[PDB]
Amino acid sequence: ELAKYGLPGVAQLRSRESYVLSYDPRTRGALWVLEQLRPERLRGDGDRSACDFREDDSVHAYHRATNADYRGSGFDRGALAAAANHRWSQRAMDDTFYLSNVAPQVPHLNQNAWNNLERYSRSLTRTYQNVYVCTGPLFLPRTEADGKSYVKYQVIGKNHVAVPTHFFKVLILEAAGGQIELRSYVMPNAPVDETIPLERFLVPIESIERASGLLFVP
């Protein structure tokens, strides 16, 4: 048999209380995380200190981000499935502090501009019955003086956790009616101004689908 000893590659799905993620052991962070925020269900009892992030013991130690990797890095532990999205229940929001839900994020971006869009998705849960949000990183290519195009991203910690160049957020908004409503955003991993209107970052989703390796048109 060709599979006599096992295949080296894992399809690394995780389904937590609060989201589903697909994990990439090479980047030491998630490919995508999808949550369904419904209203009804956002605001609730439960909280946790802003810094109580935990490594994921379901990920092999070879490919597992640790708090030490972020230590001294200048990057926030930016959660993709946001914490205030799941104040519904306690470990429903404890699952959002696993480092599998986290990518190195420029702190000004984590606290102001990505934060405003997190609010926007939390505001749009108001016009539509159900709001599904899928979030993840981008590593976008970039030319230099020689004319050739390069992907270049920073790598932090001894475990070499990748710092994304960009992040995407795609929302498909509905149950209560007829169900069109797809909206796609991308911001660079950089101190982007809070003043810029949120929709200056709208992008067609195949932009994201080609770059990310994922397919969203279902």
Phi, psi of 126 (to 5 degrees): -100, -35
Contact, 12 vs 32, CB < 8 A?
A: no
Q: Does 157 bind Mg ion (CB under 5 A)?
A: no
Contact, 59 vs 98, CB < 8 A?
A: no
Closest to Mg ion by CB, 81 or 208: 81
Contact, 168 vs 185, CB < 8 A?
A: yes
The 10 Å CB-count burial string (b at 16+, else e) for 15-40 is ebebbbbbbbeebbbbebbbbbbeee
For the CB of residue 143, give the shortest distance to Mg ion in the complex, in Å: 28
Identified binder of Mg ion from the candidate list 78, 104, 137, 157, rule CB under 5 A:
78
Q: Does 110 bind Mg ion (CB under 5 A)?
A: yes
User: Where do we find the tokens 């981000």?
Assistant: 65
Element (H, E) at 63: none
Stretch that binds Mg ion, among 26-34, 50-58, 70-78, 183-191 (CB under 5 A): 70-78
Residue 78 contact among a copy of itself, Mg ion, none, beta carbon within 5 to 8 Å by kind = Mg ion
Closest to a copy of itself by CB, 43 or 210: 210
Contact positions vs a copy of itself (CB under 8 A): 1-11, 13, 15, 19-20, 22, 24-27, 31-32, 34-36, 60, 62-63, 132, 134, 139, 141, 148-156, 159-160, 162, 172, 180, 206, 209-216, 218
Contact, 125 vs 171, CB < 8 A?
A: no
Contact, 55 vs 77, CB < 8 A?
A: no
Q: How far apart are the first and last CA of the chain?
A: 36
Residue 96 contact among Mg ion, a copy of itself, none, beta carbon within 5 to 8 Å by kind = none
Residue 110 contact among a copy of itself, Mg ion, none, beta carbon within 5 to 8 Å by kind = Mg ion
For the CB of residue 78, give the shortest distance to Mg ion in the complex, in Å: 4
Stretch that binds Mg ion, among 1-9, 19-27, 92-100, 109-117 (CB under 5 A): 109-117
Residues found near Mg ion in the complex (CB under 5 A): 78-79, 110
